[PDB]
Amino acid sequence: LCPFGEVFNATRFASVYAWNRKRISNCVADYSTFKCYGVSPTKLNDLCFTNVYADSFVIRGDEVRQIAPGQTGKIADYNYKLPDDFTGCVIAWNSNNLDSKVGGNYNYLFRLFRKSNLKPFERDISTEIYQAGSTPCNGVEGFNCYFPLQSYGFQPTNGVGYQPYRVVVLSFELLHAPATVCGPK
Amino acid sequence: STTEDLAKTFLEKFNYEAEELSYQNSLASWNYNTNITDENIQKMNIAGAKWSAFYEEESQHAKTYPLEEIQDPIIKRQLRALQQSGSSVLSADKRERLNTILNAMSTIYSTGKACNPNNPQECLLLEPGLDDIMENSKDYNERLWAWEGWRSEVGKQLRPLYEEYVALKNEMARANNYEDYGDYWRGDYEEEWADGYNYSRNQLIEDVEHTFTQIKPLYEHLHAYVRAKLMDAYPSRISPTGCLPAHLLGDMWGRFWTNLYPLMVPFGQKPNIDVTDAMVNQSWDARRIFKEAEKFFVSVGLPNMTEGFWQNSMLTEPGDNRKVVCHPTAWDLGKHDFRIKMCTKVTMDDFLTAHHEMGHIQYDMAYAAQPFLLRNGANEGFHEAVGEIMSLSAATPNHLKNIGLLPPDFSEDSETDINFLLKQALTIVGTLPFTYMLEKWRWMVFKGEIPKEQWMQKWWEMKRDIVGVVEPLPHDETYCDPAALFHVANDYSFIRYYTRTIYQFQFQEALCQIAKHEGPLYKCDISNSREAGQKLHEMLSLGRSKPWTFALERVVGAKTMDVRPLLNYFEPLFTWLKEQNRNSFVGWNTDWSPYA
Numbered sequence A: 001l002c003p004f005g006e007v008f009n010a011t012r013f014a015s016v017y018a019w020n021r022k023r024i025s026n027c028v029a030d031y032s033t034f035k036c037y038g039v040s041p042t043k044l045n046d047l048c049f050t051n052v053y054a055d056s057f058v059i060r061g062d063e064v065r066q067i068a069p070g071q072t073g074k075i076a077d078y079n080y081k082l083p084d085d086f087t088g089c090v091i092a093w094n095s096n097n098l099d100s101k102v103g104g105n106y107n108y109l110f111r112l113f114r115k116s117n118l119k120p121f122e123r124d125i126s127t128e129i130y131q132a133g134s135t136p137c138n139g140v141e142g143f144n145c146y147f148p149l150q151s152y153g154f155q156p157t158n159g160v161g162y163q164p165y166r167v168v169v170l171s172f173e174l175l176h177a178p179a180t181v182c183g184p185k
Numbered sequence B: 001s002t003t004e005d006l007a008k009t010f011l012e013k014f015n016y017e018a019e020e021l022s023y024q025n026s027l028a029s030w031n032y033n034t035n036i037t038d039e040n041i042q043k044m045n046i047a048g049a050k051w052s053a054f055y056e057e058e059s060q061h062a063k064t065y066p067l068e069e070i071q072d073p074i075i076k077r078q079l080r081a082l083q084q085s086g087s088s089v090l091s092a093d094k095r096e097r098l099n100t101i102l103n104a105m106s107t108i109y110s111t112g113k114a115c116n117p118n119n120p121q122e123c124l125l126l127e128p129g130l131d132d133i134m135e136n137s138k139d140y141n142e143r144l145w146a147w148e149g150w151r152s153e154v155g156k157q158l159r160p161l162y163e164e165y166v167a168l169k170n171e172m173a174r175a176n177n178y179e180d181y182g183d184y185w186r187g188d189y190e191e192e193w194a195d196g197y198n199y200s201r202n203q204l205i206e207d208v209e210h211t212f213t214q215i216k217p218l219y220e221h222l223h224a225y226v227r228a229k230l231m232d233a234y235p236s237r238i239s240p241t242g243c244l245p246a247h248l249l250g251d252m253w254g255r256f257w258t259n260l261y262p263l264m265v266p267f268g269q270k271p272n273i274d275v276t277d278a279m280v281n282q283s284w285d286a287r288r289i290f291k292e293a294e295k296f297f298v299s300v301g302l303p304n305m306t307e308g309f310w311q312n313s314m315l316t317e318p319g320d321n322r323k324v325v326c327h328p329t330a331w332d333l334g335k336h337d338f339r340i341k342m343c344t345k346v347t348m349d350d351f352l353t354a355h356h357e358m359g360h361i362q363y364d365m366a367y368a369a370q371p372f373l374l375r376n377g378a379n380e381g382f383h384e385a386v387g388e389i390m391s392l393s394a395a396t397p398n399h400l401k402n403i404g405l406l407p408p409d410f411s412e413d414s415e416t417d418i419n420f421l422l423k424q425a426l427t428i429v430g431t432l433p434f435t436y437m438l439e440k441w442r443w444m445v446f447k448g449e450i451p452k453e454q455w456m457q458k459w460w461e462m463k464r465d466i467v468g469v470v471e472p473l474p475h476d477e478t479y480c481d482p483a484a485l486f487h488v489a490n491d492y493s494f495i496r497y498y499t500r501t502i503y504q505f506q507f508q509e510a511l512c513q514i515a516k517h518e519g520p521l522y523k524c525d526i527s528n529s530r531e532a533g534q535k536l537h538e539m540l541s542l543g544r545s546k547p548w549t550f551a552l553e554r555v556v557g558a559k560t561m562d563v564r565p566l567l568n569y570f571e572p573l574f575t576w577l578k579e580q581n582r583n584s585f586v587g588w589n590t591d592w593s594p595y596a
């Protein structure tokens, strides 16, 4: 009665920085790896679905284990963290032959340094040269003063453990938002 | 406001950066030795140019400002390697002679040729003319003229790098900003540190007598065991009771001693086994050998390989104008890319090499979780030295016992064990003795106080002492044969004895002890054993986080080196060899010509 699965068959996945968040309503659906907490994805019909908070990213193959609330890791520290009120799951699948080009794809970034703690779902767009010496760097490369971002370099020849994956994360806030299941009388 | 985190990022960014350069150089190298075209003949100098720029600039960055106040020796050593470098500071006019004597060897070797005495122009390279005589025919003059042709028209063009070296080069390394370079060419193991133990290296060399009192009087018995059993080798010219010959030593540069042993034949007829024809006769097939030699070490609690490796490793020989070195190499492409190339041909060499290759490609992922600066096992010497002992384990009928048609009690009959398959004792150690003065040559010419009465005179006294070589036409001390070693420009190791030599000593003090046999590897179980998996697959991963002595100890139980693996495993023929002959005349007997 409504189209639901736009994000599963997506065309391209954005960078690991710009998150994509959509609001929808009154839709439901059913079913390489899948694992969630609230309820079985096939029997989930027995509960009230209220809020939709969708996102997706690209993560190297092996470190899919780091996407969970209250974990440790550089990628989690600099991109995304989750709170103690965890309600959701992480879905991913391998698309090496679909996302890797023989020449090599080198258009992705990450972060290495910070200055303080970060609240979940926070962004800093500034890319100014990083100073730690007493004498302030006025834009001199090196000497602890550099540029933060760095590429990734994926190829189809890369190994299975480090082959690219497409990452899907769905968050449903258990607020009083409307449901997506009903019937006759 | 601390220097630790100030200097750490400098290490981390380049540790993240170097992966792309390493990967690109790997594909370039593979493309070249697989596809040899004029477009590909030059890959290294252009692919590693960026790597060399990175290395040099970061070396000048880290060198000029040191890291005095750091409190973690593991990290200090880890950044020390790329902290210190050089070889690009000295003046060209004087450093050019040094790099010339180092490098110009390869050019003359590439333009060299050795040929027949009656082949003026049309003739072929060195190897095929002389390497087949001992195994095929009996022709004397062709082998006899070898050293004369060498010394007259093949070894004479190693002099332009010769005459200056032995005359002047001993002292002119004073501007090398180090103690010396022989310490790094044959001594890059002398390192002293902290955290519980201070470790040394000279105990791995000074124990010659200690560790081979049991093998030292072996020439003194073989000198008569030749007449005892090896008579069928060569009569009518070789002295029966005199000295061992030295004008027919066997080869040109004295590498191995395996070209003179297999000449005792008491019988000719036998239903032997062979990879050429007997491969598939007795309930065997050639296609599933790769699957079953996997099963034997994967059914122990490991999962199997995907089809990616299967389609990446094609099973056809090059054959055509496109050709690769049919010798298979465990390609360390990195980034979880492990690949091997081979030729379609069944041989026992092929089986042993394939076994070593799958051992490599299986143990490699144990440390796969570590970042770039730890991409190797405990020691690369083992990764290429254990091929021999795995081949030895493979060459035994445990396979026939495991497939279950010929029962294991079908031991070889008595008259079948004496012919061909009981000579393996000194094949490894027959090349050891003549390397000590070569190893110490720089170690005692670095001083510069040495006089000219001793250049390398010790050779002849060592032969008189242990071996009994009576020197023909002299390649004497004036003719510095060690200075003319062939692999000088190929930067292969000569650091311990030749390569992966002395690190093999103390590790096997308890290998089969853990593999639970009272004695040797014979009847020691490796297959279907639960203890083998937890004895190897979890501990075969060290990294740079812990010193190599901890990895050694966790296997052996002792820090010092011993020789207990040299146990009664070799007894069944030592009981034939070393009891009787302690009376006969060995070596020099004053009945022949010494100078000739």
Ligand SMILES: *[C@@H]1O[C@H](CO)[C@@H](O[C@@H]2O[C@H](CO)[C@@H](O)[C@H](O)[C@H]2NC(C)=O)[C@H](O)[C@H]1NC(C)=O
Binding pocket: B298, B301, B302, B303, B304
């Ligand atoms: C590695 O070896 C084989 C590869 O499939 C597995 O054993 C076989 O598995 C298939 C599929 O499950 C069965 O149909 C066969 O009967 C199995 N053969 C046996 C048990 O002899 C084995 O399980 C694999 N190891 C792992 C950990 O997956």
Ligand SMILES: *[C@@H]1O[C@H](CO[C@@H]2O[C@@H](C)[C@@H](O)[C@@H](O)[C@@H]2O)[C@@H](O)[C@H](O)[C@H]1NC(C)=O
Binding pocket: B192, B193, B194, B195, B196, B197, B198
């Ligand atoms: C390593 O060898 C040390 C030798 O003496 C030390 O030499 C230098 C490094 C100075 O620090 C000097 O004061 C020292 O006495 C031993 O002292 C040391 O114990 C050895 N290492 C270990 C772990 O025992």
Ligand SMILES: *[C@@H]1O[C@H](CO)[C@@H](O)[C@H](O)[C@H]1NC(C)=O
Binding pocket: A008, A009
């Ligand atoms: C599109 O989504 C469906 C939903 O299950 C999936 O089966 C299919 O493989 C996807 N791709 C294509 C090309 O249909």
Ligand SMILES: *[C@@H]1O[C@H](CO)[C@@H](O)[C@H](O)[C@H]1NC(C)=O
Binding pocket: B034, B035
């Ligand atoms: C070698 O190069 C030629 C032409 O560049 C190409 O056709 C061939 O496939 C290459 N060899 C391999 C093994 O790919």
